[PDB]
Design a protein around this ligand. Structure first.
Ligand code: 8B4
Ligand code: CL
Ligand code: MN
Ligand code: MN
Ligand code: MN
Length: 534
RNA sequence: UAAAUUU
RNA sequence: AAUUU
């Protein structure tokens, strides 16, 4: 029946001017050569994104869906949740959050300026007194960096972000925040993926894998999941929120926000014109993440039941899931995934790329990452998390007047410290750069480079400094991504690392600790590394 | 724009 | 601040 969007025809305009690369990239031109492949998505491409996300939805539910939906509500009723004092909600606003149309921004909100507090009270009044008038939203194209990919189109068109004014964002938090903190875990138990750390997510996947007699795994993602959300899904989302114990005042707000904001509304471009109308998920709302995850979980568990997946063990993070189950032979397994995918499609959550059963944990990707294995110091298998380095390397080379990528290097160094690509490429380059700038003591996004060894031990285990014998997949992929971006091959990084290492040792202090721990892989005479006080 | 995780 | 979705 219903259509995800409708368009006035007005353009999707830019928040401000969009930054462009320069003829020299001083920080990254030693990292990689092919800067022509590094691009940032712009509003210029917004029109194309709109076409791909505008389409007719038809949903057909069934006993399996209904049964799951029932069970989820008997779980939701164990949750009691409170309102948030207008003030408490203001304090959860992020520092640089986009300012309101009504002459105040986040400085004012977080500091509880009177004008801001007053407007907000007024907006929350209106939610209580009017449960129908659509709330207007702004639509913008997100600016994100990527490496080109001819196999999949050349250059991706920009994601569309749709969000209400700042006043409404706070009110949302008042009504819903406590719920967002309690509901998912109460509904999905151990299947709620955002609860876990990267290490726990690995322990969990392995425990699941291990406890089957004959494991079969797969992953599923939905194509433009936000468009696939039906008006009805969003209302079913409401009724799940209401299953909790709630202040009467919340209920009225939840319902008002549902009917006015969440199921749809008009859209205005940054220059002010009417741009279109919306009958699906808005990316910009508080319930976007919770809602996606619950809704995906409902459909997925229903589909599991439609398709006969035996003994499923799930993991859901938004529209991304992994099911680990007992194989029924490859013949039946292939049949059931086909079924799973039909069921999901009938529920209006069709796949980007249809899924496939797999029988090796390394071959299951989800959230653009996967589990792999290498050998540890004493020769035991050590399982860990990694990904295609293509994007991180591309983002590593995004240098603009306004933007430096050094923060991104560090972010990826920490998150992925056991990965061969971090250890040989990013680390070498990061430390090489700061040594020459002579800025190791300096703080990057409130982290001290010289704390890395400690930081990494806390997070990844001392094994992170001594791992070796990486998988064929991981070696092939790293090699292939450095070749793709015109970076030196690993052998060259081996050389650079030795040099960096020696230089770091020269300086003594914490610098030499970094030199010895982070770069021990690079030497012939590997020094025995023990735990670190810090 | 929203959230989660990491610091 | 980073990353993910
Ligand atoms: C907008 C989304 F709902 C998106 O559809 C959903 C699934 O992620 P993905 O599978 O990567 O993207 P599509 O399925 O939409 O192609 O997660 C939310 C999402 C992703 N990114 C952002 C963001 N930057 N802000 C807010 N929400 N959001
Ligand atoms: Cl070991
Ligand atoms: Mn998706
Ligand atoms: Mn209601
Ligand atoms: Mn996804």
């Amino acid at each position: 029946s219903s259509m995800s969007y409708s368009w006035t025809g007005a353009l999707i305009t830019p928040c401000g001017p969009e930054e462009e690369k320069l003829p020299i990239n001083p920080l990254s031109n030693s990292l990689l050569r092919y800067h022509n492949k590094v691009y940032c998505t712009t509003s210029k491409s917004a029109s194309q994104r709109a076409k791909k996300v505008t389409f007719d939805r038809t949903q057909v539910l069934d006993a399996h869906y209904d049964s799951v939906l029932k069970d989820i509500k008997l779980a939701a009723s164990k949750v009691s949740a409170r309102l948030l004092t207008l003030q408490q909600a203001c304090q959860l606003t992020p520092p640089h959050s986009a300012r309101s149309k009504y002459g105040f921004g986040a400085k004012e909100v977080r500091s509880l300026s009177g004008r801001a507090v007053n407007h907000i009270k007024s907006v929350w009044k209106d939610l209580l007194e009017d449960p129908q008038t659509p709330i207007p939203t702004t639509i913008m194209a997100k600016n994100e960096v990527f490496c080109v990919d001819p196999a999949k189109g050349g250059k991706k068109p920009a994601r569309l972000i749709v969000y209400p004014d700042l006043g409404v964002r706070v009110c949302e938090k008042m009504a819903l925040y406590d719920i967002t903190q309690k509901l998912p875990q109460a509904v999905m138990g151990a299947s709620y993926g955002f609860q876990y750390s990267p290490a726990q997510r690995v322990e969990y996947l392995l425990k699941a894998w291990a406890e089957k007699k004959d494991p079969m795994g797969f992953s599923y993602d939905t194509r433009h999941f936000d468009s696939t959300v039906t008006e009805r899904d969003i209302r079913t989302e409401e009724s799940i929120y209401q299953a909790c114990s709630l202040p009467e005042e919340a209920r009225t707000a939840i319902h008002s926000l549902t009917e006015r904001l969440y199921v749809g509304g008009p859209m205005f471009n940054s220059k002010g014109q009417t741009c279109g109308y919306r009958r699906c998920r808005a990316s910009g709302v508080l319930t976007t993440s919770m809602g996606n995850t619950i809704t995906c979980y409902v459909k997925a568990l229903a589909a599991c039941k439609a398709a006969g997946i035996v003994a499923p063990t799930m993991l859901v993070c938004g529209d991304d899931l992994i099911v680990i189950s007992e194989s029924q032979g490859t013949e039946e397994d292939e049949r059931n995934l086909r079924a799973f995918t039909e069921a999901m499609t009938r529920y209006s959550a069709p796949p980007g790329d249809p899924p496939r059963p797999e029988y090796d944990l390394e071959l299951i990707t989800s959230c653009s990452s996967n589990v792999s294995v290498a050998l540890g110091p004493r020769g035991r298998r050590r399982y860990y998390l990694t990904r295609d380095p293509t994007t991180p390397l591309a983002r590593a080379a995004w240098e603009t007047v306004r933007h430096s990528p050094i923060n991104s290097w560090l972010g990826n160094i920490i998150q992925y410290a056991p990965t061969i690509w971090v250890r040989m490429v990013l680390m070498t380059h990061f430390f090489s750069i700061l040594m020459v700038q002579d800025t190791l003591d300096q703080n990057l996004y409130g982290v001290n480079p010289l704390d890395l060894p400690a930081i990494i031990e806390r997070l990844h285990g001392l094994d992170a400094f001594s791992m070796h014998t990486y998988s064929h997949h991981e070696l092939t992929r790293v090699a292939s991504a450095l070749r793709k971006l015109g970076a030196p091959p690993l052998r060259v990084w081996k050389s650079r690392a030795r040099a960096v290492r020696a230089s770091l040792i020269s300086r003594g202090g914490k610098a030499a600790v970094c030199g010895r721990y982070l770069f021990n892989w690079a030497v012939k005479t590997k020094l025995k590394l023990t735990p670190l006080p810090e």
